[PDB]
Amino acid sequence: GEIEFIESSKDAGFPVINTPSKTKLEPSVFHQVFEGNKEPAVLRSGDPRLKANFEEAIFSKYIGNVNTHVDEYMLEAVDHYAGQLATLDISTEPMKLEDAVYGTEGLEALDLTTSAGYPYVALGIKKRDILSKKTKDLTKLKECMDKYGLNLPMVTYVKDELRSIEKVAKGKSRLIEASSLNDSVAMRQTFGNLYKTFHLNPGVVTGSAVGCDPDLFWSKIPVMLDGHLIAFDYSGYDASLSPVWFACLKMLLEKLGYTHKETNYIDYLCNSHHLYRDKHYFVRGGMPSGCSGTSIFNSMINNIIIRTLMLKVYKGIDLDQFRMIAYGDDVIASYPWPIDASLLAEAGKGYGLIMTPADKGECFNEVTWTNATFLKRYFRADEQYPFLVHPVMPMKDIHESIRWTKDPKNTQDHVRSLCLLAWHNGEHEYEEFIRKIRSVPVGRCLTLPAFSTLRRKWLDSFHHHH
Numbered sequence: 001g002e003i004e005f006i007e008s009s010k011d012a013g014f015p016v017i018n019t020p021s022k023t024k025l026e027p028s029v030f031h032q033v034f035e036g037n038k039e040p041a042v043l044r045s046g047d048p049r050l051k052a053n054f055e056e057a058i059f060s061k062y063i064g065n066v067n068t069h070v071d072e073y074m075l076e077a078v079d080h081y082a083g084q085l086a087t088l089d090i091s092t093e094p095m096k097l098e099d100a101v102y103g104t105e106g107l108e109a110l111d112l113t114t115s116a117g118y119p120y121v122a123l124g125i126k127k128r129d130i131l132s133k134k135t136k137d138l139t140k141l142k143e144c145m146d147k148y149g150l151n152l153p154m155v156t157y158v159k160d161e162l163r164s165i166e167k168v169a170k171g172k173s174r175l176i177e178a179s180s181l182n183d184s185v186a187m188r189q190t191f192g193n194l195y196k197t198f199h200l201n202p203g204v205v206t207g208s209a210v211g212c213d214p215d216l217f218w219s220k221i222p223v224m225l226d227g228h229l230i231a232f233d234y235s236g237y238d239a240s241l242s243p244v245w246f247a248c249l250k251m252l253l254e255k256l257g258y259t260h261k262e263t264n265y266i267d268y269l270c271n272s273h274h275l276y277r278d279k280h281y282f283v284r285g286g287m288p289s290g291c292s293g294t295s296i297f298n299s300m301i302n303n304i305i306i307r308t309l310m311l312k313v314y315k316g317i318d319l320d321q322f323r324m325i326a327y328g329d330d331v332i333a334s335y336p337w338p339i340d341a342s343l344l345a346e347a348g349k350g351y352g353l354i355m356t357p358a359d360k361g362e363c364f365n366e367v368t369w370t371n372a373t374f375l376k377r378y379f380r381a382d383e384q385y386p387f388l389v390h391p392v393m394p395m396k397d398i399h400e401s402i403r404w405t406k407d408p409k410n411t412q413d414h415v416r417s418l419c420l421l422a423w424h425n426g427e428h429e430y431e432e433f434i435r436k437i438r439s440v441p442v443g444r445c446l447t448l449p450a451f452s453t454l455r456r457k458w459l460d461s462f463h464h465h466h
């Protein structure tokens with residue numbers, strides 16, 4: 001992706017979008033009790049922890065674009081994947097507006113707490129002013145959609161989350177785009193049925209894990225990925241995608257029965273118009289992390305990308321024995337024969353991607369189940385039920401999360417979330433975590449699930465159908 005134009009909002013008539021510039025993250029009541037190195041991302045140029053220039057830092061993920069047409073390797077990749085997806089039977093029929101906006105099986109309602117984006121943010125209007133969960137009303141939305149239309153600017157917020165010292169220092173906070181509610185809703189109509197299928201069918205046919213539940217899905221993964229594991233990181237995936245990849249997605253969607261008009265929306269995503277604070281800018285390429293369906297479309301493209309890289313390097317390759325699962329940029333894959341990931345990474349470089357060893361990592365080492373991670377979790381067969389696998393978030397990551405909070409009022413909810421993660425590290429490690437929690441008085445005011453209970457509920461979770 002590449003920033004093509006930057007002027008001041010002022011000179012084009014847009015008002016200053018006024019995002020909040022102080023973090024919502026404050027030290028929790030457990031900040032002393034546990035150790036960690038992470039802190040709130042930098043949100044403004046003044047922040048005294050900066051050791052570089054914020055404005056430059058945040059936009060620097062737009063590394064450039066490789067000008068190219070869709071080559072022979074892309075085509076066979078698109079075909080093959082298109083092949084897998086055909087088996088799923090995806091309605092290209094639009095989705096009943098009420099379903100797109102307020103829920104249905106395999107697609108949560110629109111989130112009413114997130115931004116409605118332009119122009120509503122300028123005009124003081126929020127989603128709850130336009131939509132009601134209680135009344136499923138659509139008359140107002142319908143006014144707003146017709147009043148204001150589609151293809152509106154996006155609003156660029158700086159993500160307010162924990163980062164490492166290095167990322168705080170370098171100022172490399174992630175950006176998220178808010179799509180105008182109108183566009184959020186259009187897209188959910190156009191592609192709602194697609195989203196629905198991928199959420200309801202995570203794994204090897206979709207090549208996607210978006211929507212999944214690790215407590216349940218982990219146990220399927222080694223079954224679907226029986227070969228020699230392949231896995232790697234990207235640096236700045238979303239922003240590194242050149243237009244050619246969007247082109248491939250377009251094709252892929254057309255083979256699915258979407259028509260040219262139905263695919264204009266990808267150009268919305270690819271060639272984007274953005275508002276940030278007091279500046280206004282266009283971008284050619286890059287996925288705008290946060291708009292409708294961006295994880296799905298990232299995943300889809302990643303399935304096209306990897307296949308493309310295997311083809312261009314391993315000319316004799318048989319893709320029908322390849323298997324991958326993506327969550328946006330996070331991949332785990334397998335083939336029955338060993339594969340040199342570094343070869344792919346240098347193939348990738350040529351298409352403008354920056355692929356790196358799985359986890360931060362010295363070399364593209366061999367990946368085992370011992371060392372494999374996906375969505376930041378490890379895999380560990382249950383000692384007693386070997387066909388069940390535990391998703392194991394590192395307590396390092398759990399410790400970091402519990403030491404902060406955006407709202408102490410949810411402390412209980414927060415800690416029970418972390419409890420559902422922690423017990424996969426096993427009973428000693430759980431009980432110790434609970435001791436430390438209970439070493440402050442708030443600890444003891446919380447209803448916390450017992451190890452034994454989490455275990456039983458997990459085991460019984462495999463009993464009832466799906």
Ligand SMILES: N#Cc1cc([N+](=O)[O-])ccc1Oc1ccc(Cl)cc1Oc1ccc([N+](=O)[O-])cc1C#N
Nearest residue numbers: 107108110111184210290291292293294295296297
């Ligand atoms: N793609 C996928 C995806 C993955 C994540 N994810 O990181 O898990 C978050 C959003 C994603 O798109 C959708 C995913 C799930 C559902 Cl149920 C709907 C999705 O489409 C959207 C719809 C509405 C809004 N909204 O403005 O409220 C945003 C999106 C997007 N963003």
